[model samples]
Target chain A: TENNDHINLKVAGQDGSVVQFKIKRHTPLSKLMKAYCERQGLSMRQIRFRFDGQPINETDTPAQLEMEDEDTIDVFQQ
Target chain B: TENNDHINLKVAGQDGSVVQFKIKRHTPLSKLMKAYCERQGLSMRQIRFRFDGQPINETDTPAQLEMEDEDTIDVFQQ
Candidate 1:
């Protein structure tokens, strides 16, 4: 159990809906960010990501952002 | 510099004394804990670590705990 190389990240939209994703520790969030745009009609320009009460980019990873499993990544619009 | 692989973690003692250490994201906290014990007279067995209001272990890393830069880890004696 010490390996802890994977995490189940929960992505929360502006709504109450949340989607969980399993990703590697060093994986970039670009994959996760693309998944969201593919699943819905969200424009990357229309909304942004929020983590640790700070703005994060697709280049950010779970480790880069210091995010834990099940931690909510809130997608908000301007 | 999105590498963001390092962070300066603050370790706070029960007496409000704080020490900051910089380490890699993948590095286990064992070094930090041992350093604390070496610098201070508090024995690891006599005290424990708390992060995000939850107990943490020396084996836990910054990534494992999703700890951010400057996040404080409280070492308390019981």
Candidate 2:
């Protein structure tokens, strides 16, 4: 089940709420962005999703980006 | 309606498809990105939006970016 391994992510929102989710390592990060947008009622264009201060692109997968468990992604408003 | 003036943008996708849209100059560029994503079935993380080869942030507006009408933005797959 190595390919099915999941990674946990913590996204800190501007409102002081921290949202967490687990996703497959091979899945693109865009999935997370979409879920975040839906749950937050946010238009995808209103927030920036970043890791280690660099913006994350839609095609990036956890495995490709070498994301560690519980890594923090910051969400900032436009 | 000066504040409501719109800018036209042309987004060139990697597959050679070009999508055009009009957006308010004062509105955040993220709205354009969201519309592109929805229509193209692309995730935000799957592509990088760049103007003059510089990646655009969600907080950037057409006014802030000094985007002219008919400015071309390139959509590169990550």
Candidate 3:
């Protein structure tokens, strides 16, 4: 869930290796993500989430829109 | 050691056909466990707790008595 993610994340995938597009917290999860994505030139499609290390679909929940504290989400390209 | 559980639970292990002895909250973990056991005619040996994905022994620490929101506890006769 976006609301539960609560962190800005960006990633780039090349040769099975991923690099930090950006990683930071503060200024709300949404805004932070937006700014980081803009700066890193990452497309929205690059955003992904995982909870407890399982794939999470953020299509129909409040968590998709905002992140809560201590929730972990991972972003990588497939 | 006597104040965090906040719920009373009981179980039976007769051929794995355990039935709900009781399920109630807000009566406090200690009092609720005591009263529920008394009402259901059970001994403390009939109770058990599990948090996250591991077994938890109540005699160890604070989580044994008090449970937080969305925490799950399971009781089974082994």
Candidate 4:
């Protein structure tokens, strides 16, 4: 199955922005997303997300990465 | 009239961006505008303005200046 090869993407800017990247392991997620925005000419403000459709925020306990298959990163106006 | 003594314009950024300047003649409009934005650390996205209620964009031909007692400058998020 495609369980471990995907990430939920939810971007909330520019009317159809999503986070999609195929990268090497150990790439910092923040840097990756920022690079994506620069390349796409998108000025993203904030992100709201759910990993596997479960509620999660970037400030979660133990600072875990809630990324999962088909995860959505919601972008918002800051 | 004092009409030849000023310019009125607006900028978009920082929640209260407006173009207000006082200088001694013959300066390039574009350079003046860019300087204003830089000094204030404001990354202006766009400028929407009216020269005394005459709807105008930079694309207008034979450019004119519109300034009066005072005007409100509105800034919008990009």
Top candidate on TM-score is: 2
Candidate 2: misplaced stretches above 4 Å?
Answer: A1-78, B1-3
Taking the candidates in order, what DockQ does each have? 0.01, 0.02, 0.01, 0.02
Chain A TM-score for predicted structure 2: 0.91
Supply candidate 2's per-residue lDDT for A20.
72
Alpha-carbon error at B20 in model 1, in Å?
A: 0.9
- The runs of at least 3 residues in candidate 1 whose Cα sits more than 4 Å from the true structure, single-residue gaps closed, are A1-78, B1-4
Give per-residue CA lDDT, model 3, range B48-77, as digits (tens): 544443555434332444555444344444
Q: What TM-score would you give candidate 1 relative to the actual structure? A: 0.46
Clashing pairs in 1: none
- Write down the worst ten-residue block by lDDT for model 3 chain A: A17-26
DockQ, structure candidate 1: 0.01
lDDT of candidate 1 at residue A74, scale 0 to 100: 78
Top-down TM-score ranking: 2, 1, 4, 3
- Candidate that would win on lDDT: 2
Stronger candidate by DockQ (1 vs 2): 2
Worst 10 residues of 2 chain B by lDDT: B1-10
Encode model 1's per-residue lDDT on A9-76: one tens digit a residue: 87765432345688887788888878776654566787687886788776888998888877878777
lDDT of 4 by residue, B1-78 (tens): 234443333333446544444322333344444444444444646543334455434343212343333343343435
lDDT by residue for model 3 over A1-78, one digit each (tens)? Answer: 235323323232342433221112333234333433443356667755444455544242324535444343455544
